[PDB]
Structure 1
């Protein structure tokens, strides 16, 4: 009556003791790769019919930070896939309103999305998978689900996922992550895998007639084709947990006829503005480009570093939430300014390098800070507390650089470590 989860075996794997908040268990559980030190990761992409806003940035920046922690800090090997839904009801509707082709519209806003990601120092994924380029593969995927008896064909030529038949199987559970969120259909909760197309919509040939993919099938198809029958990580915003992500799990389980397509499902919290999700529908949004005419990439990334990735956050506009981000960014800028100059202008010919008690105390705080940051990252990517640890260390380095005769080698090593953590955060100074 309740979905079960299988933790991957630890034998032969990279073991860091990292714990992550897994939506499949609704708990923090130890992260263990399926193979070695490898992480196969699929992340749902944007719907490219319009500009991206600060809420989209929160999700992609937060998972960029997580990816950099996993790769740059823990040295996992991440193979990441993000889809682009360039065919969708919204794209069709917008393209008729504006009197341009569906592809021209989608390519424009896909281009602007990646430009915005690059402006925010977000790394591109290994693979970018457009629906328009995967329709043939989607048809083949749907054929297999039908052959496994988990989908049926309507008279009009649509294909629907058969929830009742899927649930019946002892190896399958429907809606593993939100169990309680559950005429021609057998049951109302069945969802389309293939939609019969109106003659005026864009459409593709199939064994069942001209149509389009349903809302969820492209993600199962693309990830299964490139990454296979087990994903280490699947991610997205919390609104996608159901129906979209739970439906992907059912589709992929139905295709492979197994019980666990994803080991760790990670959901970022929403950015709210004035108490409500930042939303195109609510017209309360700030585009990323507008945000970048007021604040820098570092400042926006600090905003997201200050908020735990899997919790919702409130954005107060008119600069209110950004005051703290600007202060922190300024302290990082001024810290680097001083330490870089002290290093550059240090003179080995005239200095004294005796390792003093003041040098030893700063070094002790330095090594301790490294251990604290390590524990924060293992604690479900706790960047707010890691950022605070860096701030505390900087306060003490600033005192040391002002008064004590300086240990050039220690300052260089401290500069390199803080650069390493800032690279991990995606900050550029």
Structure 2
């Protein structure tokens, strides 16, 4: 698809640890991740404004660990990620900024590429802009209308196309939310529960009819533009198929976004479950809200880099907390990450060190146990403190620890 970014070198660490076990948002429990020879991952990409904030970084670094752990286990990986380059919040920001929405989106997607490369994040194999996926959205809305899962609303001026929330009997399995909770979150996260003519308040926009002052594309259901959830449903389905191991993204995507994107794909395919695991993570700003320029809580990766922060310290700072805990950035967090990075660099610069077999095995076990980076970091702290306090006589373990931290954590010592 679009140009993404360059991968760093990935060293190969001899040996293997346990297979990855991951919490599944849908079943609300840790379950084994069991891919075929090619493991498949779709992670919802950015809406291209506000650069790469630390919420972005926390999300895509978490899936970088999965990517890296799959490669460590010998899997081939198919990583697909989108860009929501046409989007109502994007239009709003562009109008507020006095800039064209495509100039804004192109510029911010480029800043994302640069931050992802600086953070040494492994790139997706297919990087797909929403505007380049219109045809696949159209093909799949055609299928949804043919089966009756979708309908055109009775509105001559604005004949929007909607997906029936009861098109699948299992609608709601991924979030587990009841109707009242869905109504609240649907309204506050882009849905239109009060739109006249819908069969159910929870019916989701599939194709928004042409409006004055809005970009539009041709289609057999009239000129318009895609709904948000069917964009990612169609990209994931057409690129990966039904054998999706992981659907991932930020915390707020549990509902409505991933609930409907799964329901759209299960309805067209007849399959019971779109993805085997649903994985959510992110990070709030200082005020407990998602990071946004208009809140004055926005911390950008490029800001940290301009202040002289090592990108590996950003990774370590984000990894100091578990991805399903409420992570928060602060000066204290940055300071411990800087001190941890310097400590690790000291030990891996030693002429000789104690055997690294146990700590590498322990790091692999902790990462395999629902990405327990706090305990993996603590195990490395312990090996480093033993090497620096008491020493050892393996001339290879300093480099071997550095290469493992590189391959598995993306941290460059």
TM-score past 0.5 threshold: yes
SS in 1 for 2:348: helix
CA distance in structure 1 between the aligned counterparts of 2:150 and 2:310, rounded to whole angstroms: 49
Equivalent in the alignment of 2:13: none
**Which of 21, 24, 27 is the matching residue for 2:23?**
21
CA distance in structure 1 between the aligned counterparts of 2:319 and 2:371, rounded to whole angstroms: 10
CA distance in structure 2 between the aligned counterparts of 1:279 and 1:269, rounded to whole angstroms: 13
TM-score by length of 2: 0.86
Aligned-residue offset at 1:231: 0.6
Equivalent in the alignment of 1:118: 117
Higher RCO (CA 8 Å, separation ≥ 6 residues): 2
What stretches of structure 1 of length at least 5 have no aligned partner?
1-13, 344-358
SS in 2 for 1:83: strand
Equivalent in the alignment of 1:374: 364
**Which of 235, 240, 243 is the matching residue for 2:248?**
235
User: For residues 239 and 97 of structure 1, do their structure 2 counterparts lie closer, same or farther at Cα, with a shift above 3 Å needed?
Assistant: closer
CA distance in structure 1 between the aligned counterparts of 2:98 and 2:327, rounded to whole angstroms: 38
CA distance in structure 1 between the aligned counterparts of 2:62 and 2:177, rounded to whole angstroms: 26
SS in 1 for 2:228: coil
User: For residues 50 and 30 of structure 1, do their structure 2 counterparts lie closer, same or farther at Cα, with a shift above 3 Å needed?
Assistant: closer
**Which of 377, 384, 408 is the matching residue for 1:424?**
408
Query: Within 5 Å, which residues of 2 pair with 1:112-151?
Result: 112-151=111-150
Query: Within 5 Å, which residues of 2 pair with 1:334-349?
Result: 334-337=346-349, 339=350, 342=351
CA distance in structure 1 between the aligned counterparts of 2:49 and 2:368, rounded to whole angstroms: 38
CA distance in structure 1 between the aligned counterparts of 2:137 and 2:96, rounded to whole angstroms: 28
Q: What count of residue pairs does the alignment treat as equivalent?
A: 379
CA distance in structure 2 between the aligned counterparts of 1:384 and 1:91, rounded to whole angstroms: 35
- Does the CA contact (< 8 Å) of 1:422 and 1:428 recur in 2? yes
TM-score by length of 1: 0.83
Equivalent in the alignment of 1:216: 229
CA distance in structure 2 between the aligned counterparts of 1:136 and 1:70, rounded to whole angstroms: 32
- Does the CA contact (< 8 Å) of 1:82 and 1:128 recur in 2? yes
Larger Rg: 1
- Cα offsets for 1:175-215 (capped at 9, x unmatched): 53233232210111111000012132110011121111112
User: For residues 99 and 304 of structure 1, do their structure 2 counterparts lie closer, same or farther at Cα, with a shift above 3 Å needed?
Assistant: closer
CA distance in structure 1 between the aligned counterparts of 2:214 and 2:289, rounded to whole angstroms: 34
What stretches of structure 2 of length at least 5 have no aligned partner?
1-15, 183-195
Q: Does 1:327 align with 2:339?
A: yes
Equivalent in the alignment of 2:399: 415
* Segment of structure 1 superposing worse, 378-387 or 102-111: 102-111
Aligned-residue offset at 1:107: 1.2
